[PDB]
Amino acid sequence: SRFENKLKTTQKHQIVETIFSKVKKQLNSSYYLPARENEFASIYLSAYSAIESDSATTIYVAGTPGVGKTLTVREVVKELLSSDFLYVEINGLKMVKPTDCYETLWNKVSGERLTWAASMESLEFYFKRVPKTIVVLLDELDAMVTKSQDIMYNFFNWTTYENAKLIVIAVANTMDLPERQLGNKITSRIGFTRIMFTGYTHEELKNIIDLRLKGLNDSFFYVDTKTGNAILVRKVRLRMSADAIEIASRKVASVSGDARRALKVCKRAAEIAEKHYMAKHGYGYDGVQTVHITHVMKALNETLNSHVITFMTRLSFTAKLFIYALLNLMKKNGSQEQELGDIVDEIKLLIEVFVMEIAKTLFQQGSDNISEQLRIISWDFVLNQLLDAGILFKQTMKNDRICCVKLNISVEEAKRAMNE
Amino acid sequence: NVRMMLRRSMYKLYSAADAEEHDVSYDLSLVENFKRLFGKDLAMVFNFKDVDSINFNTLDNFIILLKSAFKYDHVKISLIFNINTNLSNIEKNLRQSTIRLLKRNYHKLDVSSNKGF
Amino acid sequence: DPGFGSLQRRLLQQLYGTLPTDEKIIFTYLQDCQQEIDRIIKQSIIQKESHSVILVGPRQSYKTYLLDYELSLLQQSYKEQFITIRLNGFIHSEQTAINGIATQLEQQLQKIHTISSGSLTEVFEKILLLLDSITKITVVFIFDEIDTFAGPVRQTLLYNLFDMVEHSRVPVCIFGCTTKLNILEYLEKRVKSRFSQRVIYMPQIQNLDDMVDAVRNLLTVRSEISPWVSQWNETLEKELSDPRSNLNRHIRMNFETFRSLPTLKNSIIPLVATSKNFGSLCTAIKSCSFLDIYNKNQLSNNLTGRLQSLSDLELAILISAARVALRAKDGSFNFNLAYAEYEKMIKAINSRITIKLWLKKDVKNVWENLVQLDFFTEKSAVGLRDNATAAFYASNYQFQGTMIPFDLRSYQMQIILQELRRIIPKSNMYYSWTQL
Amino acid sequence: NVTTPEVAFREYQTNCLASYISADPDITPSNLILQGYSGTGKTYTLKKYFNANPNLHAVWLEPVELVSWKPLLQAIARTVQYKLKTLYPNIPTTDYDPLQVEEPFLLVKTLHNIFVQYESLQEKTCLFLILDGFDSLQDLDAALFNKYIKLNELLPKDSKINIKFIYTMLETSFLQRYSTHCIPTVMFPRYNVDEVSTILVMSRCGELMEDSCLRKRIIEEQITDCTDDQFQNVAANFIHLIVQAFHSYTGNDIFALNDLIDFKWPKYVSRITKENIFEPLALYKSAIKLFLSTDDNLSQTYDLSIISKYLLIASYICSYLEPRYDASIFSRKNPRYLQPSLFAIERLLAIFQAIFPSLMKANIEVFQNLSELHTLKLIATTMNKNIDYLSPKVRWKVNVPWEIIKEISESVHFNISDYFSD
Amino acid sequence: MIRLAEAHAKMKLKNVVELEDVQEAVRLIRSAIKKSVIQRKLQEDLSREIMNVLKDQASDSMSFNELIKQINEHSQDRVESSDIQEALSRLQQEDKVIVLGEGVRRSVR
Ligand SMILES: Nc1ncnc2c1ncn2[C@@H]1O[C@H](COP(=O)(O)OP(=O)(O)OP(O)(O)=S)[C@@H](O)[C@H]1O
Ligand SMILES: Nc1ncnc2c1ncn2[C@@H]1O[C@H](COP(=O)(O)OP(=O)(O)OP(O)(O)=S)[C@@H](O)[C@H]1O
């Protein structure tokens, strides 16, 4: 509003719009929908009736994140501006305290700042007195349910008044939410509409990608060979191999069916070809191009593959000495949780069961003057280093002997990474 | 605790300080600036009413906090230990490093309603 | 000469990295990792990218050193082009960090050329509307310990900045730095779907040769300042090229236990400031005997020098204290069981031969230091709470162990009996009592 | 380059603190750990550096005279603007409220407000903050010490004045929680038996030759014109013997030696002669009585009445006794060391009616002395001290050791050692 | 064990007991009642130490028995020779040393 005038600055020194820059502009998650096409009507025809008849209803939609329920209901109200209402995005997680949404509503009727207490008095005074038109989105309803359900009873008791000019639209995480957190007295007020949103399917996941790739798929750029700048000296083209786009779809629809996850794995795979193109020619920052299948093979795996195995073999010696002692106790006792003094008891014993040049160094950094150490060198350090790494876990006790230690990653992969 | 034993006690003298004086923080900050906050110097006295019911490590940690006030030279401290009985019990409970702090100028005055009838 | 002292001026600030940003030296075993960071960060400002990342690696791993190095590398040429907002998860809670952002915003505006005023959620929707919305100012976020924001209960602040990736016309970039490795499972579902999933692991010194190559680039001065420099540079590598040299020998120890450069980097700072002439310094890195004294002092009072620095009685109490501790199943022991044991032990030295057996009323004064030398612990005593409100819940709780007297607080053991035999020399008379 | 001082036994440690501290901020490391137990003179050897270095500027804070972190932030912000007033008095200032801060954001919010008006200075000056006693803060936890480490980096790094820290703490188990931050540490060792005596003689000659208790005893006895060196010898003969007859009792302390001297000194003064000033060995043989006793304890026959005395003697019976055995062995038809068991009500009067000399039936005064004994904290509740009256589940227990029971048994002629049988 | 050592001396037609004969005897009583990371570290420091003592002198032409009597006599008792054989085979695979027969052990050029 105000400060966007101050967020603008002047000197913009000719940023290089490369080949893959114009992809990521439309591969931004912003800018009719193919997948939830008919269900857009099922909201809207449920909404169009109450709007043009001055009533008060409730609409309940659920689903996993990434399915458009943040998006679709925005497309409902957007066309409605063409044809009497006040649009508010009452987000649950964007409220600091749960009562703070009450302040917004009384702010968004006349423009007054009153307390959560004093708002809902005048809100209740609004909802049963006004002679005769308010659209409210109650997003992410896991946030506003937590304390004692006294907030959630209000947001549906206002719907019961026949003289209440309000239209509520609830969007939750799960359909189960008025059956495993709320009471039945709320569950009578929630209704039984319950519009379910499933995942996306992999065919439609192809049909959502090309909507971003509408005017740019297999099109042509105008490029100078000196700076790598592309314009919608050569006239090059860039093509997208649709089969790699398909194998992006057949995984994301399989695991999650998430519309952000499908776009972003294409977005991550796009910039892999960006740096390899910049590696071969070096246009910096101041015949026919493509994106291979081998890009989305890596980037999809790049969502999966770890490093704690590679972290463990790149740790210190006494780190790998520590874990090898720790699995030795877990196969000695079979109790998966060993006392800390017994580990210090073991690393002593695992010496005497090159080793002497180790055992000299393992308890003192040379130095005859200051040798004879009980516990090993930097034993507090590696145990602190294994703690904040998340591999280990150690309960809090002022005794430094009988404080228990519990593993936090799978002990077999600890056994397996130890073998290297 | 150590905390509210300090905080209520600084509050209790502070209103007693303004009433004779004719915003601030309730801790030892007032103790050094009492020469500047109220003009004349300070000699406080501590009527510990029922001393054997208190967890003594709180009392032992309390008196070390009062030991830090000994470097300002415009304040004088005096402690009154109203025990019920059993002085030998009291030298058992405290830390021995603080008994040597206590044993500088002690006075074992007896106050009993029944003293030789 | 001051030219030797001028070399001390150069070498010290090289060991701290406080040079001007043109000559800050990155070690070779991570040059790839800064460039992919650079490819992230410089196309976020210049090419107006809006993508996030999480830095992950252990402590003291140049992570905060890498990021402001990029900023200083971009502060020289892209001055007004961006502003930075830096948040620590340590210094900021969940709710004051909103006031942390808004107050750090407005002070940039006077540097680039009504926001913090209001309630905490009043200013919250303000920075929502100021961010979601010639060229546009880009904003770089610097987050230290982002894992503590990733708690179980609310996770609000993560959810807003990650949605600012999706919708805002203002180009942003988020930089999470942490050390909890599996950071991605710590997030819930609805926040991770906002996340662009790209994390980058920080490298470690994977070969012995790597940090040897690092310390060479660390200590060598390349710019001409002192007459001593050309002499000083060849003395460094001659110690480093020889695998039998002591500096090369002691670096191998640092590769073994720590395998972390700023630990070794710490050791050199007194070693190069303790010299007063040029020739003494060259002998110091030739001898490296100061590193022995240094590792002596770092070791001198953790547990062993605690034990060596006690008198005859303090040993004799503790030696008895473990011989009681071996008998019970949990190992706990009272003060009366110690004293009784102590007396019995005493009743053996005179009969086998003149040693002042002390009273009851005095051992308490010795017993006081032994518990605050941490050679004993209380039986069920959680020592340090993790955060503030868990410690405040332990302060109001009146305790029962003080309500039993001093001589019956069931003290347990920190240093076990069998380990005492290895440290106590046989010349001491109580050596027959270490073993049972 | 710096002007180092010189002290008695910190010859290595003076070098490192001269190493890790310079007036230049770039050479100065950010955070620092001075570690050692109480009894090493770290507050001594730190200030002893600072008096020899008037070029730098030190702001001295004291956590032990505070109680919490919320005033500790108020302690910092009040003092730097207090100090910078007394360092650059020409610089104008919008003085802020140090009472206003209570949260760790607000410090770096206010230090962003403080340092910006001081930007016009001529060179990068450092400013050393000193915290003394960080472990004995009485509301400490895990996530406070790291909270003060990163305070430097939240500051703007390009300001003309740079704030850096030095932390004084003890209890080296605490430092082992934070070794992974790898901040530079200078450990301070404990002492040995000679250097305790060597420190103590050069620190206590300035009072024990100038005390009036000597100066009275000078003119009271026939004063031979003994030298100050002759006063120095008897002082040195005192110190070299008092550490010899007490070192096993005190350990390697300095504070616990600094007061035991000031208890046994005038009692030593009275037992000197005119002649034993030249005769030190026989002087110890005449003043022997104090050198084998502690004299730190400033055994009561207890005040309580007769029926309350038998009320105590029945309460000690359930120390090692249990309800499975007591009703058999006390019919009308060893845990001397161990911690006491738990009572209930009316088991007292079960044993009290038995062991009293039908001769008694009225129990009003017997109920009187119970809560009399509760105020004496000799028998206390297991639970909180509130609802113990109405018989809910409340368990009771003694808190008196065996010897005071043993004297009070014979004080009422009652025999107790028969009924304790291992 | 002295009766065990004299029975070791009873076999193989010996009238005087020998120093090697008790070694096996003890192995006996230690076995009658009964690739690690520390073994990898042992092989690593043994490879580092053998590279330093094989490259410090000028005359690289030196066999295995002279190597055994020159690196184990300045310290205490015998380390496992099969681990030294495995370390030299590891260096054979990494082309650090060349075997070239049982009479001379030389490094790479
Ligand atoms: N059918 C679609 N057509 C075009 N763009 C889409 C479609 N579905 C999702 N998107 C895009 O992907 C983003 C995903 O956000 P949404 O799925 O609307 O949020 P969501 O499903 O509610 O997940 P939340 O908000 O965390 S519960 C949208 O903001 C759009 O930018
Ligand atoms: N102002 C600074 N200039 C240059 N180097 C610095 C500065 N502050 C810290 N360092 C270096 O930072 C390194 C420590 O790594 P850091 O990234 O700062 O800490 P980290 O553990 O890696 O991440 P943090 O700080 O714990 S969130 C050391 O090598 C320091 O020399």
Ligand SMILES: Nc1ncnc2c1ncn2[C@@H]1O[C@H](COP(=O)(O)OP(=O)(O)OP(O)(O)=S)[C@@H](O)[C@H]1O
């Ligand atoms: N080298 C020395 N020369 C002279 N006096 C010394 C020396 N070292 C220590 N002292 C004395 O030792 C005393 C101990 O002072 P402190 O600094 O309080 O001891 P401490 O170990 O710091 O315990 P604290 O106060 O709890 S940190 C000082 O007051 C000095 O008088």
Ligand SMILES: [Mg+2]
């Ligand atoms: Mg909604």
Ligand SMILES: [Mg+2]
């Ligand atoms: Mg001190």
